């Protein structure tokens with residue numbers, strides 16, 4: 193029993209974390225086989241933040257301008273290239289700790305673990321979701337750029353996020369490991385800002401199913417809803433639309449608990465209307481939207 | 497910026513988890529140098545759950561009765577002994593991944609990371625506090641016994657918890673690595689319940705400081721109070737008394753924000769008396785008490 197925001201064990205990622213220095217700037221890189229991946233803005237100086245020309249900054253660098261430190265050992269950079277907004281530094285040594293891994297670009301609503309690091313040394317691990325506005329609500333201080341987000345379903349680490357910057361409202365923006373940003377952000381110091389955020393409806397539903405599985409039914413009601421009427425109400429609370437795809441994804445949790453998806457949608461409608469009247473659900477006084485259907489099934493028992 | 501419930505990186509502990517089987521029971525063990533540590537209740541059968549005699553059950557076991565699997569490799573058990581409620585299984589091979597470590601016993605209100613495991617395989621990590629009632633609000637399924645809790649202070653892992661059981665309210669109870677239970681619990685199937693819990697006051701205050709550091713300031717006010725007056729409020733709302741030690745510990749945060757601890761205590765007093773009035777703090781509608789002052793400082797600095 194119990195339900196917690198659970199990260200994946202971080203060891204497989206820890207052994208890949210390195211420190212990358214260019215000029216005065218130090219941040220983190222991800223050392224996989226013989227390549228170190230890091231944000232390309234490591235090559236920017238003070239006068240470059242506003243309108244950097246990365247091709248022009250990079251062509252002026254040689255391999256020995258990049259200092260890569262793995263623990264106490266220097267790695268020798270023998271090549272470099274730029275892919276979208278990540279730098280890829282070829283090094284002379286393949287990482288002996290390289291896990292089974294792949295790169296996956298995720299959709300809004302997906303969760304992942306973040307391994308926060310500073311100077312190439314891991315600091316802490318926590319769980320995040322990709323918000324519908326393509327930002328994440330992370331915990332990052334200066335020097336954390338190049339920290340990565342990942343899942344580890346089975347033995348394969350799927351890297352999905354690399355941290356690049358903090359937006360004015362205190363949320364965070366970054367790229368997949370191919371250097372494409374999530375959302376419309378750019379690695380430039382311009383005025384840019386997150387779209388209004390919305391609640392990840394399919395995740396709230398999944399967490400309500402988790403509360404039923406752990407034995408809590410007080411928020412159910414005798415009603416149902418059509419899909420369209422649910423969405424008409426949900427968007428008046430800045431909830432993301434719920435699609436048939438999402439209704440299908442919730443099928444297994446529905447079968448386990450005996451509560452049809454649209455019946456759970458009727459309970460969410462009532463919660464949004466009534467609030468919680470001093471009660472809690474899985475220990476929270478707010479509706480939680482950073483557990484996916486997949487996360488609930490992994491964390492919860494198979495018996496309600 | 498940002499504030500998240502954050503666990504220690506678990507890699508140094510992942511390399512110590514093994515599977516331990518004894519008869520029809522398999523749970524997790526902790527493999528450090530040439531000893532595997534696991535709950536002693538791994539040696540009970542069904543007849544033995546109600547009133548085990550552990551020392552007598554131990555005498556009947558031979559070394560070969562313990563199947564220890566480090567991943568895909570068997571470890572050979574060459575000795576076995578008991579210390580309090582933990583079984584110590586001497587193995588033939590020292591763990592090549594043994595980190596620098598200590599066994600430490602934590603105080604209620606202190607936090608630690610839990611590496612939840614199943615069949616010796618790490619499966620998730622999350623952050624927990626030792627509650628004043630000596631339970632922890634974990635997330636454990638069947639097969640998680642032997643999962644451990646830990647802090648890392650430099651390179652050194654401080655192992656503080658081993659998971660033994662779930663209570664009927666769905667919270668959890670375990671021992672330190674020397675086998676002493678946290679709380680008045682026994683490793684036997686008997687009538688056991690969590691006692692009434694209290695809120696960890698020093699931690700709520702730390703978390704209020706985290707919120708101010710992160711720009712959430714609406715709950716600050718012009719008022720200050722005294723330890724005596726505040727503690728009268730604390731006990732009314734089932735909060736732990738705040739001691740002068742706690743005020744000292746919060747010293748750093750109070751200087752960084754220019755908000756004296758008793759200054760904060762007036763804010764917390766008002767929150768307890770009047771509620772939040774529809775607002776949140778660091779994204780929470782209730783007052784969080786599983787962040788220590790150290791926790792806030794380490795993450796906010």
Ligand SMILES: O=C1CS[C@@H](c2ccccc2F)N1
Nearest residue numbers: 233236241357378379380381
């Ligand atoms: O808003 C932002 C975009 S990325 C980051 C950045 C951009 C250019 C140069 C340096 C640097 F740190 N901050």
Ligand SMILES: O=C1CS[C@@H](c2ccccc2F)N1
Nearest residue numbers: 537540545661682683684685
């Ligand atoms: O309530 C409890 C105490 S520990 C646990 C237990 C008791 C006896 C034998 C095995 C075993 F796992 N469940």
Ligand SMILES: [Cl-]
Nearest residue numbers: 297298299302
């Ligand atoms: Cl996805």
Ligand code: NA
Nearest residue numbers: 514566567616
């Ligand atoms: Na193992």
Ligand code: NA
Nearest residue numbers: 717719759762
């Ligand atoms: Na005040």
